[PDB]
Amino acid sequence: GHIYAVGGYDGSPDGHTHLNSVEAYDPERDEWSLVAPMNTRRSGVGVAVLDGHIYAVGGYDGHTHLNSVEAYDPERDEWHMVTPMNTRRSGVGVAVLNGHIYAVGGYDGSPGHTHLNSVEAYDPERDEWSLVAPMNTRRSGVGVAVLDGHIYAVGGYDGHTHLNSVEAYDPERDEWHMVTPMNTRRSGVGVAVLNGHIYAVGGYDGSPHTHLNSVEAYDPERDEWSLVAPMNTRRSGVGVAVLDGHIYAVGGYDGHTHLNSVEAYDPERDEWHMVTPMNTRRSGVGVAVL
Numbered sequence: 001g002h003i004y005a006v007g008g009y010d011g012s013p014d015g016h017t018h019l020n021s022v023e024a025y026d027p028e029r030d031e032w033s034l035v036a037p038m039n040t041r042r043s044g045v046g047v048a049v050l051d052g053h054i055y056a057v058g059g060y061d062g063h064t065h066l067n068s069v070e071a072y073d074p075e076r077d078e079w080h081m082v083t084p085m086n087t088r089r090s091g092v093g094v095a096v097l098n099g100h101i102y103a104v105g106g107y108d109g110s111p112g113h114t115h116l117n118s119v120e121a122y123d124p125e126r127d128e129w130s131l132v133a134p135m136n137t138r139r140s141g142v143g144v145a146v147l148d149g150h151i152y153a154v155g156g157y158d159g160h161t162h163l164n165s166v167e168a169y170d171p172e173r174d175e176w177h178m179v180t181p182m183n184t185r186r187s188g189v190g191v192a193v194l195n196g197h198i199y200a201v202g203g204y205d206g207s208p209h210t211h212l213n214s215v216e217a218y219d220p221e222r223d224e225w226s227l228v229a230p231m232n233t234r235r236s237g238v239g240v241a242v243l244d245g246h247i248y249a250v251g252g253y254d255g256h257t258h259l260n261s262v263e264a265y266d267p268e269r270d271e272w273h274m275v276t277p278m279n280t281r282r283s284g285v286g287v288a289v290l
Helices: none
Strands: 003-006 022-026 031-035 046-050 053-057 069-073 078-082 093-097 100-104 119-123 128-132 143-147 150-154 166-170 175-179 190-194 197-201 215-219 224-228 239-243 246-250 262-266 271-275 286-289
Touching: 003 053, 003 239, 003 246, 046 093, 046 100, 046 286, 053 100, 053 286, 093 143, 093 150, 100 150, 143 190, 143 197, 150 197, 190 239, 190 246, 197 246, 239 286
Parallel strands: none
Antiparallel strands: 003 022, 003 286, 022 031, 046 053, 053 069, 069 078, 093 100, 100 119, 119 128, 143 150, 150 166, 166 175, 190 197, 197 215, 215 224, 239 246, 246 262, 262 271
C-alpha cells in the first residue's frame, strides 16, 4: 500500500505555488516518488479512494475555487476529469461511504456562498453529483471521516469562528446530528479513523494557540474526545491517512513554513516519529491510501 500526497500549496519564495503534482510514499522502502500530475493545480483539495481510483475533489488553483473533480488510475498512471460538483469548494472534506463519495463543506470564494454547509454525493456508476442534507454549521477547512455507517464532520471554520463542534451524518435517514465537541477548536484539521476511534490531527485555532501540534481521539461508544500524544510539528492544512496500523500526518503549515515533513503515529506506543520528507512542501494537501 502507498500513501499519495495530492496537490497542496508550496508558499515558499522559490515555490511552484498551487500544486498539480502528486507523490507516493512506500513505507517499506521509506521513499517518496513523484507520480503523474493532475490536470488542475489544487490546494485545499479533498481526496478519497473508491474502487481502485483516487479522486481529487475541488480545491483552489490560484485563481479559482474549483468544482472540478478528477480521478487517478494507478495502473495507467493517469488522471481524468470526471463530472464536476454542483458547487465550487476549496477546503472541502471528502469521505467514501457505501459506494458514494461525499463532498462536505468547504469554501466557495467566488464573487458565491462563502463558507459552506452544503453537502453533495457522487455516484460513480451514474457519474452524477447530488445535493444531500446540509450540515447544521458552515465548515471550511473541515475534516471528514467515516465510522460505522456515519460520516463525521470535524471542526472547520464558519466564516466567523474556528470550530470545536462535530456532527455526524446518517445516510439512511439523510440527517446530521451534533455530537460531543472536541477539546480544541481546529480549522484546517486532518482526520482519520483507526481501531474504532476518530483522530483529529493538528489544525489552527484562530481564536484570540494558533497552529496546532495537538491530536485528540474520539470514542463513539462513550461520545468523548481525549487528547493523545502531540505531534512533533505544528501542522494546519495537514493531510492524514492510515496505513498498516499507523496514522501519517503529511505536510501542512507550521505558522512560519509550508512543510514537506511527515510523521507517523503508533497507537500502541502513543508516539509520533518523523519519517522521510516529501519531495515538495505542501500545505492544504490531500492524502489517500491505495
